[PDB]
Amino acid sequence: KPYISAKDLKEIMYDHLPGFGTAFHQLVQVICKIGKDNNLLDTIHAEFQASLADGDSPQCALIQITKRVPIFQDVPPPIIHIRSRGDIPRACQKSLRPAPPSPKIDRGWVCLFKMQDGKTLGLKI
């Protein structure tokens, strides 16, 4: 069992972020779910801290996690099912892009939004 829970890591990360419902907030969620599912929460937490200690901003640290914690190169961006495009947080809207064939988390593709109508948009940082 992890010293830090998915819920608590999310809160710690959220505490460091400006605004609400940004692409970074969504990235926090992707990171925590991947960490929780693969039992890497503590590793992820430490990497977050280490990046901040290097002098990186919190946004930059989240990006660093995707490049430095190996698992984020080895799994595809999560597919998140929603009903319509309005379900996506306002702050994320500006970051939606057509979904390429091979999006990579470590290149900024946070997740894929799959709508009810069958359409798909990627979230890109």
Resolution for this experimental structure (Å)? 2.4
End-to-end CA distance of the chain: 32
- Burial (Cβ within 10 Å: 0-12, 13-18, ≥19) of residue 50: middle
3-state secondary structure of 68: helix
Query: All domains of the chain, ordered by start, with CATH?
Result: 1-73 (1.10.8.950), 74-125 (2.10.10.70)
Identify which of 66, 60, 70 has the alpha carbon closest to the alpha carbon of residue 110: 66
- Alpha helices, DSSP H only, in 5-109? 6-15, 23-38, 41-53, 58-68, 71-74, 90-93
* Element at 78 (helix H, strand E): none
Give Cβ neighbours of residue 26 (< 8 Å, ≥ 6 apart). Answer: 89, 92, 110, 111, 123
Give Cβ neighbours of residue 113 (< 8 Å, ≥ 6 apart). Answer: 80, 82, 85, 88, 96, 120, 121, 122, 123
Asked if 44 and 10 count as a contact pair (C-beta separation under 8 A), the reply is no
Q: Which approach determined this entry?
A: X-ray
